[PDB]
Amino acid sequence: NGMPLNQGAALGIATVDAQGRIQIVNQNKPIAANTISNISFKCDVCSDMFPHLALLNAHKRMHTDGE
């Protein structure tokens, strides 16, 4: 939980030499999650797209579910 420190980057080169501040402890950063990274949920059935997953997900229920 929580947001990573801003004004920086995940991949690249750091300005820390022999001496400096201790950077965050990282094991393995997972990829492929709901972080709204310029992703829009669009409905292929009727072209219904919304800024929310619930909106689209709920919408699709009408298109398909128990038919």
Judged by the rule CB under 5 A, the positions of this chain that interact with Zn ion are: 43, 45-46, 48
Q: Which residue number has the CB closest to Zn ion?
A: 43
Amino acid at 55: L
59 labeled part of a ligand binding site: yes
Q: Is 43 flagged in the annotation as binding? A: yes
Phi-psi region of 62 (alpha: psi -120 to 50; beta: other; left: phi over 0): alpha
Q: Which CB sits closer to Zn ion, 48 or 55? A: 48
Pick the closer one to Zn ion by CB: 7 or 47: 47
Handedness of CA 22, 24, 28, 32 (dihedral sign): negative
Single-letter amino acid, residue 11: L
- Specify binding-site residues: 43, 46, 59, 63
